[PDB]
Amino acid sequence: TLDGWFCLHDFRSIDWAAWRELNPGNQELMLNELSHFLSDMEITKNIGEGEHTIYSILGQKADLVFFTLRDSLEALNEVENRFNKLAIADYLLPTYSYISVVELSDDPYQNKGVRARLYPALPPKKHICFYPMSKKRDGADNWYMLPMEERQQLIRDHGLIGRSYAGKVQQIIGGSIGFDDYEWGVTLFSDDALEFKRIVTEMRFDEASARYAEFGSFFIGNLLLSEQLSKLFTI
Amino acid sequence: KTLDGWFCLHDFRSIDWAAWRELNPGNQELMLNELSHFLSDMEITKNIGEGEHTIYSILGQKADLVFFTLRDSLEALNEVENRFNKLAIADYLLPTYSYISVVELSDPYQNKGVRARLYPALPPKKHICFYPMSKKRDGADNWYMLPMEERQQLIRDHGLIGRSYAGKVQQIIGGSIGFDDYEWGVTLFSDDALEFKRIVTEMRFDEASARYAEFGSFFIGNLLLSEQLSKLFTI
Amino acid sequence: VKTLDGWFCLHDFRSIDWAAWRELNPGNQELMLNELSHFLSDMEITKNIGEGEHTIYSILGQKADLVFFTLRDSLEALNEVENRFNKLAIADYLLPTYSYISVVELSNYLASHMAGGDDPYQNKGVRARLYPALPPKKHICFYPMSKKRDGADNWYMLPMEERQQLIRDHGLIGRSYAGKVQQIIGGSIGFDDYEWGVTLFSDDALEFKRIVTEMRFDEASARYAEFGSFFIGNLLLSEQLSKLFTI
Amino acid sequence: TLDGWFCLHDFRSIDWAAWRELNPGNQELMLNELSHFLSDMEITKNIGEGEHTIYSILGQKADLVFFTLRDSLEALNEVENRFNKLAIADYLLPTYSYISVVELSDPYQNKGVRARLYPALPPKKHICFYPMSKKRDGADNWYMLPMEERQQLIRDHGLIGRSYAGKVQQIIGGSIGFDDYEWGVTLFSDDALEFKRIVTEMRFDEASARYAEFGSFFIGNLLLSEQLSKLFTI
Amino acid sequence: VKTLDGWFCLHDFRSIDWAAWRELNPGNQELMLNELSHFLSDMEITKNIGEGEHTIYSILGQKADLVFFTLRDSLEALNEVENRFNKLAIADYLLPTYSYISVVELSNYLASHMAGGDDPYQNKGVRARLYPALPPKKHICFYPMSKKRDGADNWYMLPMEERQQLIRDHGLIGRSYAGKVQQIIGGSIGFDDYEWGVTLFSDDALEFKRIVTEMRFDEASARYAEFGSFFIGNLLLSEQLSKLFTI
Ligand SMILES: [K+]
Ligand SMILES: [K+]
Ligand SMILES: [K+]
Ligand SMILES: [K+]
Ligand SMILES: [K+]
């Protein structure tokens, strides 16, 4: 398999109780520093050395997710440390995270059609859906014990689903074997959140997932631009 | 395929009685008045027909209160969530659990009986019961690997039980595949709590649930009107 | 599959915040304990009029320091006890660690009374089970449990007569411990995370270990029982609460 | 099944941050109170009413374990409450605990049996604790086995512990009805590698291989009362 | 089913409390960083006299920020390092998030040395594996694991000759990533919650994903492996600390 950018899903909850105690002046300074940090990220993306986006997560799991993509673990780890060193980061409590690397099955690494997948531009879709997953190794339902022939056939039929949801849902698959607790981090983008439920359900009735898919938690959110972050942190 | 309605937020909170006690009577009253106006705007959204909301006092240590909110978009639902947390009193309402889903039903949308289910008016029943569930995918007991006909039969016989409790137990089924950790969010309303125990027990002896259902935690509570909030928060 | 249901129950486990408690002066500790004694006397009044029950046991281990087992005829009454308790000044030092909600349950697998076109709730023998007076046994044992639904071992796919047989044989063991162990079975399907909440009372702790062990070799439990956490404790009277909260 | 002393495994973590903020004056006073506490524990030991020991645990699970044995649940709980009421206990955060009773699958007045039911804790250099239960999962159901089969398994299992005798001392505490697992196993040895050897060897015997379910494992080093002041001294 | 055992191991995962650390002035932060430096210099001495090893990596994600992998020849020494570490003033800002105790292990499935009535612990080649020098690779990968004992897939019920074949085929994959991935196998049966603590080192993190994936398709792991949490990190030298702890 061919690998692309290293990915970080960073889920945060806003400590409103502490944030409320800050005067408007200091709240302004911390947001000013954040905007500067966000402009930094934008520059890295403009030179094609990374990607990033922010979505507001629903429910008590988190308030925000910071999805970041970079060319190396060193180039990903300093973003994480640089972010935590921000003043406002004290009010962004860690609730969950995920580490992965963009994954995909004559040089392919120059094929500009393949580059668009390994180093994907993040679409500004209204909504986002994230969940980790793994392939089962339980009794008769053991994905990794399947023959090469049958196992590939399951992947074939599975791919036809996402193929049918083209223009409705965009997927980013990140392998996490050796990097995190599950085997894949799946990120979905769409302007209609209902499409997330439809594709994952339709997938769940397909044998590939119906028999071998193990799922972690599901996180769903809405697009959050810089022009929306200010009113968000304004009580 | 299914039909979807309002997006749902079950927001469970525990009351920080230790912290709340430290507030003088004056400050406690101001925060209640701020909450009162918040609920007033919730009532506006309810009247205009762009959602619903209700509050119940939960029994046990899982929570003290549940804020069940329904809206016509995820943006609107996240708005209520953040706006709620920005309240002064919210600092004393600690998050213990939450669930995200959308009202689900298996043209119809302009059929005045269907929309009544997809956009349900919350009845002022004396008790509520909530629990998340999922259909199992474990060996011989795999719901999503069953033939279509066998599935319909199991759903059919399951449906027979629900209609037998009509007039005693009102249900709201919220699909959460792609939205949360389980596959459905079940909400029951009844004036007799024991009806919850009767319908869920009877269901559990039906094959659809007996063989294929997985259950999360169960939350039961009592109806709490806005007028009774002042008395509740008075030590 | 049918049940007779009595009092709604609350097992309220609490841990004592000794760090915060030792900061109060004896005068303030006295006022809080005074308010608690009043609260507990209120509970006793409800008991004396036959509209509920309550008891306190000291739990061993880090799971909890105290359990407050309370029984009431409605969830509105039960919740009110809960809210009223937390509003106590001393409750700020009683940290929640675990709880359970159930209702006293009598299943119809075996009979509890003669069936003669007759109202069971008027049967005093039945009422003594539905609305049980709590015995002042020296020790308590609580654990939630459920019936498995796992492949070949699926309790809820069994025929009625087969479940009857299993409950019957299970019962034989249960009644061999009559006079040594008293049992309160609370159904919690639809009310909590497990399907039942079992409370045992005895003047000898080892009896808890004996009955549960012997049950575990009986097919009803050996094959179909799924257990949660176990809690063991000692009876705590009001006349030794002041000694407990005194450092 | 014969039953002896009631047991408490009390695992604690040291709040170094809060402990550091205390000036050495308070720290010494709290350590003195703990010394008087442990002094009274030794009296109970010498008269023959109970036992106690302390071990420094490795890893983040805990820093210390207080293993206490008493004749009744009243006395055990009293020590537990007496311990928490100590000023120093505020800096000893609870991380894990276990309740059991010394189990032995008129014998009660025989010195030989009493040595088992009411065991003196050896001052071995190391300790190992883990809870466990017997499986009731599908075809692997220990409690649905015929007695004759179950007896042979226990017999084949017993042979292992006896070969490790003198190198590893074991205290089995039954916890059915008392805690979340069915047994609490405590091992003592002057060589921690012996723990790894006996548990490994046991796990290949059909009794544990097929029917054992384990909880968390805790390893620690012997810690005397005189070593506490230098442990808590930064 | 014997093993050769070397240094006792401690993986100490920590997270940086940036909020509290920020409140500290650079004068005090400097002082704590200096104390940490003297601590690591003492660790270097122990390493130079040959009484153990130690290294530090920066973990990615919220699981941790740092891991302090330490190796010693006794549990007394290993626990003293642990106690000394926490007694550091800077340690208050290093919150414990996870840990794993184990000992460097060589299984007897395949031979590590030739026969001869010849003590293996005197073999220079064996000692190099039991008391391994930590390679300064760019990245690290740690994960605990255990062999399954679930129904048909029961590793500990397998015949010896079958476990051998499985480990043999398993070893071929590991031996194929030579010069790219170095492995430290720490046995933890009786020491921690899993049966092994596996530590990988490589200058290319993708090799971790490559080896574990290929391994997971081999029957030994495809059928019998149980995995815990995975931790991925970047190498961090003592001179890089002050850089890291500068806001
Ligand atoms: K949120
Ligand atoms: K409550
Ligand atoms: K206790
Ligand atoms: K430790
Ligand atoms: K990190």
Numbering used by the authors:
A (entry chain D): 7 to 111, 122 to 251
B (entry chain C): 6 to 111, 123 to 251
C (entry chain A), E (entry chain E): 5 to 251
D (entry chain B): 7 to 111, 123 to 251
Task: Show passages lifted from the paper.
Chlorite dismutase-like proteins are incapable of performing this reaction and their biological role is still under discussion. Recently, members of this large protein family were shown to be involved in heme biosynthesis in Gram-positive bacteria, and thus the protein was renamed HemQ in these organisms.
A crystal structure of apo-LmCld was solved and refined at a resolution of 2.0 Å. The overall structure of apo-LmCld subunit is composed of an N- and a C-terminal ferredoxin-like domain, as also observed in other Clds. In the crystal lattice apo-LmCld forms a homopentamer, compared to the hexameric assembly in solution. No electron density corresponding to heme was detected in the active site cavity of the C-terminal ferredoxin-like domain, despite the presence of a potential histidine residue as proximal ligand. In contrast, an alanine replaces the glutamate in apo-LmCld. This flexible stretch of residues aligns with the substrate channel forming α-helix of chlorite degrading chlorite dismutases and has a major impact on the access to the heme binding site, as shown by tunnel calculations in the respective proteins using CAVER. While in NdCld the access to the heme is very large, in apo-LmCld the access is significantly different and narrower, since the flexible stretch of amino acids is positioned in front of the putative heme binding site, as also reflected in diverse characteristics of the access channels.
